[PDB]
Each structure stands twice: as C-alpha cells, then as structure tokens.
Design a protein around this ligand. Sequence first.
Ligand SMILES: [Fe+2]
Ligand SMILES: [Fe+2]
Ligand SMILES: [Fe+2]
Ligand SMILES: [Fe+2]
Lengths: 123, 123, 123, 123
Amino acid sequence: ELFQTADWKKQKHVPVIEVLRAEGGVVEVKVSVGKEIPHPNTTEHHIAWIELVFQPEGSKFPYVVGRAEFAAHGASVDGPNTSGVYTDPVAVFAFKAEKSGKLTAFSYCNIHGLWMGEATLSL
Amino acid sequence: ELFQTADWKKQKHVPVIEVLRAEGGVVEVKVSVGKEIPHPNTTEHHIAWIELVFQPEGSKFPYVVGRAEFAAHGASVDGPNTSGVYTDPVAVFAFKAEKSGKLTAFSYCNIHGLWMGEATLSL
Amino acid sequence: ELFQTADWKKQKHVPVIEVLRAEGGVVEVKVSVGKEIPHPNTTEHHIAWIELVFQPEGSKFPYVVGRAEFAAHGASVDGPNTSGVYTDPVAVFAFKAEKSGKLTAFSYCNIHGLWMGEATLSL
Amino acid sequence: ELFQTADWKKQKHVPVIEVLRAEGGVVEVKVSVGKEIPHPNTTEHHIAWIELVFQPEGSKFPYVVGRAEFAAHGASVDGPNTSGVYTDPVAVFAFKAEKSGKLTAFSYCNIHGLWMGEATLSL
Ligand SMILES: [Fe+2]
Ligand SMILES: [Fe+2]
Ligand SMILES: [Fe+2]
Ligand SMILES: [Fe+2]
C-alpha cells in the first residue's frame, strides 16, 4: 500500500486528525504531522502537503475538503537551510457539514512516501 | 492589473492577513477572504484558494510559505449545492522565521479574478 | 477503499496512463480521464486534478512526480457555463528516471470521488 | 511587484508560453521554464510550479486555466540528489476557449522568487 499507516504515538509520519469545534454549521478540523514526536523540516527532508477528505454518512462518494501545501524549507541562494523560513506540517480546515462521517487525511514526506490517517466526525 | 487590491472591511474579495502569534521564531498567520463582509460559497461562485508569500528583511527574493486550497462547494450527484459540504476560505499558516519581513496574500475567486493583501511581520 | 480502480458502465473515471517518451531516461507521461469517452466538464460537474506517482525499482518509498490542476469550468459573473473557458483533464509530466518502476496516477471528480490507475515504466 | 519579468533568451527563470493549437475553440498551451538556458533541478534549487492565467477579451475578470506542480527533485533516504527522479518544469494545458485573449503565466523558484511571462492567444 502506497498509503502507510502506523500508530501515531510511536510513528512520525502519520497525519493526526483532531476535531476542534462545531459552531453554527462550521466544523474545524486540525490535521498535523509529527504531533507527539516531531518530524524534520529541512531542505533535504520535509513534509510537503496534507490533504483532508470527508465522506458524510449518506454519501456514495467522499469529498475533498481541502489541501494544505507546505512550500518553504530553508532553501536560499546562500545554500540549503539558510533562508530561515520553515513551514510546519500543520493545517486547519473550516468547513460546513450537516451530517456525521469519516474524515481521511493524507500526507506526503519527500523521502518517506505517502501516509494516511482516519477519524470520525459526529454531528 | 491582475491582482485587485482594496479595503477589506469594504470589499468581500480582499484576503485578510492576521498574525496570530509571532514570538521567538514561532509564527502563526491567519488568512481569510470575506472577514467583514462574507463572500458567497456556492458551486457557481466561491473562493478557491489562498497563497501566502513571505519576504524576510535581508532577502532579495520572496518565499512562498504555503497554499490552501478550498475544494468542497456543495456539488453532488443530486445536483449543485446539495451536499452540505462547503469549505470556508480561511487558512492558518504555522511557520518559523528568523527575521521580520513583509507578508503578501493572494486569492482566487472563480468568477471575480485574483486578489491581494499585504501585512508586516514583527518578531 | 477510497480510491476506486474499476470504471463504471457508460462513465469513464479511471485515469489512463500513456508513455509518450522513454528515451534513455528522458520520460514523458500523459494522463487523461475520459480520453475516448469524454467526461463532462461543467461548473457543476468536472474533474479537478490528477496526481502522478512513480516508484523506482530499488526504492522503498514512492515519489510524487507532479500534480496538474484544472481550474476553469465555465463559471463567470454571467452564471454557470457562460465564460467559455474549460480546462480539459489531461496532463503531461516530464521527468527523468534512471530506473524502471511503477506509475500510479490519482484523480478526483468533484461529485464522483477519488480514482486510481496504474502502469509500469520500463527503461 | 513580486513577479519578476525578463527576456527569456537571456534569463532562465522566465516562463515561456507556446501556443501549440488554437483551432475552432480548442486551445493547447505549452508553458515551460528554461527553454533557452536550462534551470537546475536539484534538491536545493528548483522550479516548483507553473500557473496559467487567461483573460478572454470580453471578460471583466481573468480566469486561472490551471496549475502544474513539479514535485520530485532527487531527494531520497540516501540524501539529496540521490533518487534519480527529477521533474522537469514543463507543462501542457489543454482547454476550451470561445474567444481570443491574453495569457499570463506565473512560475516559482524556491530560492529565486516569482516569475511572469505573457503571450496572446488568437483563435
Ligand atoms: Fe520523513
Ligand atoms: Fe467572487
Ligand atoms: Fe464525475
Ligand atoms: Fe532559480
């Protein structure tokens, strides 16, 4: 499987989903990589993006809610790891949802392949 | 000019930059379109993405911090605006910075073209 | 499983991979959805993107080659399907490969979910 | 202005736009970085994406045609520039247009900032 899954307590690359809030029709879901025990952010090694998917209970198909790209990793004309701008693999998605469902998160490490995390959304 | 810019309290499409935190190298910036006056989110008309660019003081070139795509706008097999899943154009960027610098936000409406906002990052 | 890998009856969603070039490692890969039987492209219903993944023979992890986003679906200030601009779901990924390996392409329809198709690239 | 522009014969960062087809409403646009003078593709220094924008002449607003991400730059578990997979900054955008218009392409280098090129689309 292209999408690797691991315990997030013991494994660095699993994208972790946290349902923070559910206000006025609007859910806010936090997704992060390297939550308890941190992942590197270097020119050579970094998390590039996270994509969040939501499949509502009555739906035949899942929907992509969004995608967060982490594009800065210290590269500059003065050489790798010199720009001082490093983007964290952490994202917050605000979306309107009416019913409950399964949230799926995908993440990509530039040297460690593709990863997946899951959680349930109760409305 | 392709990137339209106006007052954000006065115009729905201007992406608004809010520095939530900026202490000790640990920065968090909130970006949103339609802060004062909400922008619609239907399948036919919606904000599609936000891109954050950051240029540190000593740098000749700007760096892209990140990009947030907002992909769900209610489309489903039951017709447009039927899914109950709508992504709000608000994004949160967490990144490390070593110097202060200038922030630039870009946004896209599928029917109203491209937009821009600016702010300063103080550490 | 989220990624559907088998196409339906009269409806073509499976992303098709065609190798246009493979000369000494200088590769060109075309990916298309609904190549022969066109897939609809309207403001309400359209393919949003294709992502191509490549995993070399000696590699433990796969690498993402690229992603092509198709952003125009006819929406304009005059209403859905009025702008006359529609981006076709076809992409060309140009990359170097030094080894043979596995190609995996992913695509997303806004109302019909996520899809996966595969091919092997031989040098 | 963030988007730098130069002659593309004398500067390898300028995205070069080439109209491959424009027959009866069927447009094909090739955009590429480093047509004349190749740009390096290393883990440390590389072109990340190209975005195509088009404003049909009778339109108040420009439309984003598409966006191409070039994600592989040779990085692997054995260190930078070790994968043998390097994605070339070249993209092909296939789209429907009903009128002629103006094309604008934007591109990004991770250390050299943002770039812009223009061309006219006659149908
Ligand atoms: Fe990693
Ligand atoms: Fe708008
Ligand atoms: Fe579809
Ligand atoms: Fe460069």
